[PDB]
Amino acid sequence: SLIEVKNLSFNRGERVIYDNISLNIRRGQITAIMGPSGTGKTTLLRLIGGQLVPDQGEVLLDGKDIAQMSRQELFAARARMGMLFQSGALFTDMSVYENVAFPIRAHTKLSENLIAELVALKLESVGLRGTEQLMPTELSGGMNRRVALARAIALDPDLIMYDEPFAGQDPIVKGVLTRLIRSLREALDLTTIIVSHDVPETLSIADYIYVVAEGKIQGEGTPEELQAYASPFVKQFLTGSAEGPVEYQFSHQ
Amino acid sequence: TIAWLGRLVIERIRGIGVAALMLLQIIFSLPSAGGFGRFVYQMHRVGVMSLLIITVSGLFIGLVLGLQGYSILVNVGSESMLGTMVSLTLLRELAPVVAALLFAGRAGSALTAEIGSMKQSEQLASMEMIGVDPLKQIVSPRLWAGIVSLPMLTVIFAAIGIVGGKLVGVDFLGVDEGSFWSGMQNNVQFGHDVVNGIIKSIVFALLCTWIAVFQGYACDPTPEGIATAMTRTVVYSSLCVLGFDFVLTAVMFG
Amino acid sequence: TIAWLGRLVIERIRGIGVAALMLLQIIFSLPSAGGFGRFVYQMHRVGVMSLLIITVSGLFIGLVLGLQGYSILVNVGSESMLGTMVSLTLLRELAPVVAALLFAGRAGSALTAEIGSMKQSEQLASMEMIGVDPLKQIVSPRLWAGIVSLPMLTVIFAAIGIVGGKLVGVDFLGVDEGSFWSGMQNNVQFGHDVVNGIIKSIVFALLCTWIAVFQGYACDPTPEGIATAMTRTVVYSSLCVLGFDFVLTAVMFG
Amino acid sequence: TSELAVGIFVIIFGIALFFLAMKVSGLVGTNLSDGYTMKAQFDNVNGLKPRAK
Amino acid sequence: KSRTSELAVGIFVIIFGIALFFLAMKVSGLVGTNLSDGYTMKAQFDNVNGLKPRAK
Numbered sequence: 001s002l003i004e005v006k007n008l009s010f011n012r013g014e015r016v017i018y019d020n021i022s023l024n025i026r027r028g029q030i031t032a033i034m035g036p037s038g039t040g041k042t043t044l045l046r047l048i049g050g051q052l053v054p055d056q057g058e059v060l061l062d063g064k065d066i067a068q069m070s071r072q073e074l075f076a077a078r079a080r081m082g083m084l085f086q087s088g089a090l091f092t093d094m095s096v097y098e099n100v101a102f103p104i105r106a107h108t109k110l111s112e113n114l115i116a117e118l119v120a121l122k123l124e125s126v127g128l129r130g131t132e133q134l135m136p137t138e139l140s141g142g143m144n145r146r147v148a149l150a151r152a153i154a155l156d157p158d159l160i161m162y163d164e165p166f167a168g169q170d171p172i173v174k175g176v177l178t179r180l181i182r183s184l185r186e187a188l189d190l191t192t193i194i195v196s197h198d199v200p201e202t203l204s205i206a207d208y209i210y211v212v213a214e215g216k217i218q219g220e221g222t223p224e225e226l227q228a229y230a231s232p233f234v235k236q237f238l239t240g241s242a243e244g245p246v247e248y249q250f251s252h253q
Numbered sequence: 254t255i256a257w258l259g260r261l262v263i264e265r266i267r268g269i270g271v272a273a274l275m276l277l278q279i280i281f282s283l284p285s286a287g288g289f290g291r292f293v294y295q296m297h298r299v300g301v302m303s304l305l306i307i308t309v310s311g312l313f314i315g316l317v318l319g320l321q322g323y324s325i326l327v328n329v330g331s332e333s334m335l336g337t338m339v340s341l342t343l344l345r346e347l348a349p350v351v352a353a354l355l356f357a358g359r360a361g362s363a364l365t366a367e368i369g370s371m372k373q374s375e376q377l378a379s380m381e382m383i384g385v386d387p388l389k390q391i392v393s394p395r396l397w398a399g400i401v402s403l404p405m406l407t408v409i410f411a412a413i414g415i416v417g418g419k420l421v422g423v424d425f426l427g428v429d430e431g432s433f434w435s436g437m438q439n440n441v442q443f444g445h446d447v448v449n450g451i452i453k454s455i456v457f458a459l460l461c462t463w464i465a466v467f468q469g470y471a472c473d474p475t476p477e478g479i480a481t482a483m484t485r486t487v488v489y490s491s492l493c494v495l496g497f498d499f500v501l502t503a504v505m506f507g
Numbered sequence: 508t509i510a511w512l513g514r515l516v517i518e519r520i521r522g523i524g525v526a527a528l529m530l531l532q533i534i535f536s537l538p539s540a541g542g543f544g545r546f547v548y549q550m551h552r553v554g555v556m557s558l559l560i561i562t563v564s565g566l567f568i569g570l571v572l573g574l575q576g577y578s579i580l581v582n583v584g585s586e587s588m589l590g591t592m593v594s595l596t597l598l599r600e601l602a603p604v605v606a607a608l609l610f611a612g613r614a615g616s617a618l619t620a621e622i623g624s625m626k627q628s629e630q631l632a633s634m635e636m637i638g639v640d641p642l643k644q645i646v647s648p649r650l651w652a653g654i655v656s657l658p659m660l661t662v663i664f665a666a667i668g669i670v671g672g673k674l675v676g677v678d679f680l681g682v683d684e685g686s687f688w689s690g691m692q693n694n695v696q697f698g699h700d701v702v703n704g705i706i707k708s709i710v711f712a713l714l715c716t717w718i719a720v721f722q723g724y725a726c727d728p729t730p731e732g733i734a735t736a737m738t739r740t741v742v743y744s745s746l747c748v749l750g751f752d753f754v755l756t757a758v759m760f761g
Numbered sequence: 762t763s764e765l766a767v768g769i770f771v772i773i774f775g776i777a778l779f780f781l782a783m784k785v786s787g788l789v790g791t792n793l794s795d796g797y798t799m800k801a802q803f804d805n806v807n808g809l810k811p812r813a814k
Numbered sequence: 815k816s817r818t819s820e821l822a823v824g825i826f827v828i829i830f831g832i833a834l835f836f837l838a839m840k841v842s843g844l845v846g847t848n849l850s851d852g853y854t855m856k857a858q859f860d861n862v863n864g865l866k867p868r869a870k
């Protein structure tokens with residue numbers, strides 16, 4: 001569904017990270033967020049309607065304010081989200097089978113036979129069929145990400161958030177993750193959010209991009225449009241040029 | 254300059270208030286919502302894995318008390334005291350303190366590191382995003398496994414210590430055995446002194462585990478934070494045990 | 508299945524061999540006197556920063572010994588015995604053990620964590636290419652601060668413990684200052700009740716710090732390893748202190 | 762492995778009893794039964810005690 | 815997260831004040847208590863060799 005965030009303001013550690021952010025997450029589309037590191041990218045996603053509490057503004061799911069409205073709905077509503085947090089988390093004390101199975105037990109009451117079959121299907125969707133009994137700690141890095149993703153899509157959620165999936169990796173893996181996103185956005189009718197520093201990849205994936213820095217949106221558009229509005233900040237940011245509104249510390253004497 | 258200290262004191266005390274709040278939230282007996290197989294499992298790491306360390310320590314303490322007691326008693330000429338003193342020393346003061354300090358101590362440090370790691374790694378954040386309240390999965394069985402385990406280990410420590418005491422005090426050093434067992438009965442009792450040893454260990458078990466959970470869990474994700482938290486748990490666990498040991502012994506036997 | 512234990516034991520013991528080799532190099536050759544002028548700085552984090560903990564524990568231990576001694580000694584000779592027992596206990600068994608373990612905790616885990624990070628960040632490794640041998644620049648002043656600091660702390664622990672003992676045993680509970688002080692002089696000999704406390708302290712200072720350095724300077728550059736190293740330095744120096752304490756006291760007073 | 766944790770922790774319990782029973786023996790007190798109270802008058806009980814035989 | 819901060823200090827002050835009380839109070843079981851209704855009397859003597867304060 002559509003997600004709207006309006007007039008968002010949030011202060012952490014006595015500093016404002018966000019100041020009147022206004023976002024429109026378009027249904028069935030890939031929405032992406034780009035910007036300098038260390039400026040709230042994870043935080044902004046958490047404030048989408050996760051565990052963080054804004055000081056001002058509203059979060060709307062299907063147009064409804066999630067704050068207060070109600071306990072049971074919200075519990076169930078939570079079943080509509082899946083996420084990869086930073087490096088991606090796997091529980092170390094659980095087998096791969098259990099890591100994918102886990103969220104199922106938060107909302108359903110199924111027979112062992114059916115929970116097992118769902119895990120098998122979800123692991124095959126990311127190329128992991130047959131790795132169920134290995135402990136996750138014994139996997140290579142490429143597989144750790146794929147296992148975590150299988151968990152994220154385990155409940156047939158509508159929204160998948162990838163928190164910095166392209167930040168630092170192997171070019172082979174980048175090829176695979178790109179393909180999984182393309183495959184899944186269609187196969188599951190998903191709305192997705194990609195938040196990433198590696199501008200060249202984001203630019204060819206997202207349908208719509210926001211550029212966020214210093215707590216404010218500093219330009220928005222499809223990648224074609226962002227290139228048309230060369231505010232010095234956005235232009236330097238999206239090109240990698242070392243010239244623009246950045247600083248060095250010197251004065252001769 | 255000076256205000257630096259002032260800010261440090263103020264923040265540490267604020268943190269205590271948070272810890273107190275966390276303890277209240279976790280202690281309500283809510284975990285019955287899920288299975289307890291997790292508890293039995295958790296006990297493996299806090300209790301069973303530490304038996305070797307506490308056992309070896311108990312044996313050395315027993316043997317030391319035996320030799321020091323003896324080299325003093327030979328100047329009284331009254332060897333019946335080995336029974337009376339090995340038993341009172343271990344039951345009233347050392348099993349409740351040595352066990353508490355070796356326990357947290359090792360379990361204390363390891364538990365702190367493990368929970369804190371789960372915070373740093375984002376595993377805990379994911380659980381809330383899924384909808385399973387982490388206090389009922391990650392924290393609950395850890396706090397309780399610690400409560401049951403330390404008191405049980407305290408008893409084993411004393412038991413080993415008494416046996417170690419006799420092993421040198423009576424069997425290598427020539428003391429008539431009958432006076433040892435009689436000396437223990439004369440006049441320390443199962444229904445009083447053993448009981449006070451256990452009560453102190455319940456108190457210590459709560460202080461030690463409560464701190465270890467708090468230090469791991471309640472912290473903003475600073476990368477250097479895990480090592481600092483581990484050191485901090487050992488220091489606070491230790492002072493809390495000694496401060497409370499004084500006030501409790503002052504009443505139980507005052 | 509079973510061979511697993513086999514492999515664990517074999518490797519841990521290989522590691523002790525390595526530790527012995529490391530110790531030899533650090534103590535054996537240290538010609539760079541010009542850079543050792545900084546160990547006084549290093550001492551700040553081992554000695555200066557640890558007085559608060561040793562001092563507070565020394566006071567609680569003294570007060571506890573006072574109260575327990577008294578409730579037993581009213582049936583035997585408190586007028587003469589509080590003096591003799593408080594001072595012999597602190598000089599012979601507790602300052603060398605309680606201070607040694609509190610130290611192993613507070614200084615030991617902090618020190619191992621620090622070397623650990625020096626290695627994990629690769630910072631330490633970058634010195635090899637600059638021609639500065641890290642053992643002479645990083646490790647040397649840390650091991651020496653440990654050797655000097657624990658013995659001085661051990662003495663303070665006892666000094667406070669005497670204050671604690673007297674404060675309750677003589678001043679609140681009704682005993683003569685005269686016989687307390689003279690009793691201590693009659694039974695406590697410098698040679699060797701004070702001296703043996705110091706000898707045991709040196710042995711523990713070397714053994715305990717040696718382990719903390721060794722484990723911090725770990726082989727495997729994995730973040731999980733820092734927490735493991737911290738737990739292990741507390742456990743290993745703790746058992747070693749108790750093991751060696753037994754043998755040394757057995758000789759000194761046997 | 763959960764099977765090992767379950768099959769192993771029973772040891773802490775087997776050990777707990779072994780040593781607890783030992784503790785009872787080492788410091789066993791007096792188990793009174795069918796007790797009565799009685800009273801008697803005295804002119805002087807100097808140094809008599811609350812737990813005297 | 816500004817709002818949580820205050821409550822935390824208030825909790826500290828109360829739990830801490832209670833702990834201080836506990837120590838000051840509990841130690842009275844042995845030290846600082848007369849354990850009596852408090853009446854006093856005086857007497858004089860020719861020789862008090864070997865009395866102590868706190869004798870029965």
Ligand SMILES: Nc1ncnc2c1ncn2[C@@H]1O[C@H](COP(=O)(O)OP(=O)(O)NP(=O)(O)O)[C@@H](O)[C@H]1O
Pocket residue numbers: 012013036037038039040041042043044164473474
């Ligand atoms: N819970 C917390 N409370 C207080 N401070 C925190 C907390 N978590 C992290 N920090 C700080 O708050 C911010 C965390 O989020 P964020 O800025 O979104 O990271 P990020 O941009 O994804 N990091 P990076 O991936 O390196 O670019 C940073 O400014 C941290 O210094």
